Design a binder for this molecule. Sequence first.
Ligand SMILES: [Cu+]
Length: 125
Amino acid sequence: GASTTIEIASDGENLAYDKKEFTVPTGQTITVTFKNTSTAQQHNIVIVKGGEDVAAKVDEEAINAGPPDFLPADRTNIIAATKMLGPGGSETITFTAPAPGTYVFLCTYPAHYAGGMKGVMTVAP
Ligand SMILES: [Cu+]
């Protein structure tokens, strides 16, 4: 089920992605295209280096960091991230898949993570 090309989008106007999981192969170049399909909301996708603990810390850094991108100053805990996309915006990010394991992805727009806008990237060995 592992793929090197991933398409993901917001679930219309809801605080969710259209996928809560996807699998990628370790050590290979991954392409992820994220589409903000909402009418009036801002979304990104941020893939963190770890699980729910790392995601919570990033999410907190993000809200402190503020607009327009709501990302921490550096990517020490971030595998990859888009910019903060407007309604109808899309962005493709490229990264080398990290070590095999489970990696949380989330939207870091204020309240969106707590709102359920999250999932898991599984990296196959
Ligand atoms: Cu969002």
